[PDB]
Amino acid sequence: GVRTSPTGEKVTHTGQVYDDGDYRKVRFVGRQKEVNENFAIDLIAEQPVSQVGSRVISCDGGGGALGHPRVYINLDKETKTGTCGYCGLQFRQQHH
């Protein structure tokens, strides 16, 4: 989420932050640094893993044509989940 640097400036979800000697932080004096506080990396991690009963599952992101291109995810490895390359949802084969 939004942490702060020693100078007090917020760190963006891309890791950007002016360091101590960077004059460019003068642009924020009397104004503000726009930062989006909903870090997508943290939000996708909150989602639970779907347990499915097949070796291959498909994801379109939900909402049909309002989602992403439909992709098929292999679930043979049991040492990791299958992750959707588009939306980051995770799937795991139950039993096998």
Partner 1 sequence: LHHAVIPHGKGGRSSVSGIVATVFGATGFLGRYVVNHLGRMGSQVIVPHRCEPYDTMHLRPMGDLGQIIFMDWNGRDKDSIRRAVEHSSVVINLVGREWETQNFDFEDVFVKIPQAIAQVSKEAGVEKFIHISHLNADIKSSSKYLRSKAVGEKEVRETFPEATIIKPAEIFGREDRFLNYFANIRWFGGVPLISLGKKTVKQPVYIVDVTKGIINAIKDPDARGKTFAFVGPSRYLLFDLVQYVFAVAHRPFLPYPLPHFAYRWIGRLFEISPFEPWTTRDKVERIHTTDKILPHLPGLEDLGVEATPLELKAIEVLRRHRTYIEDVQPAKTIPTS
Partner 2 sequence: TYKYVNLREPSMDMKSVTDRAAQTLLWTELIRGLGMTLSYLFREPATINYPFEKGPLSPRFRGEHALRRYPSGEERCIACKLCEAVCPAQAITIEAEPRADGSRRTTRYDIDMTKCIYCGFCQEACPVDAIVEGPNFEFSTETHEELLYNKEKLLNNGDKWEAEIAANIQADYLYR
Partner 3 sequence: PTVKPPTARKFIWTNHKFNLSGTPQQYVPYSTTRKKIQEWVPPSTPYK
Provide the binding-site residues for Zn ion, judged by CB under 5 A: 59, 61, 84, 86-87
Binding stretches for partner 2 (CB under 8 A): 12, 14, 34-36, 38, 40-41, 43-47, 61-62, 65-69, 85-89
Whether the CA torsion 44, 45, 48, 54 is positive or negative: it is positive
Binding stretches for partner 1 (CB under 8 A): 21-27, 29-30
Report what 59 binds from partner 3, Zn ion, partner 2, none; CB cut-off 5-8 Å by kind.
Zn ion
Whether 33 contacts 10, CB under 8 Å: yes
Read off the amino acid at residue 28.
F
24 versus 95: smaller Cβ distance to partner 1: 24
* Separation between Cα atoms, residue 50 and residue 40, nearest integer Å: 19
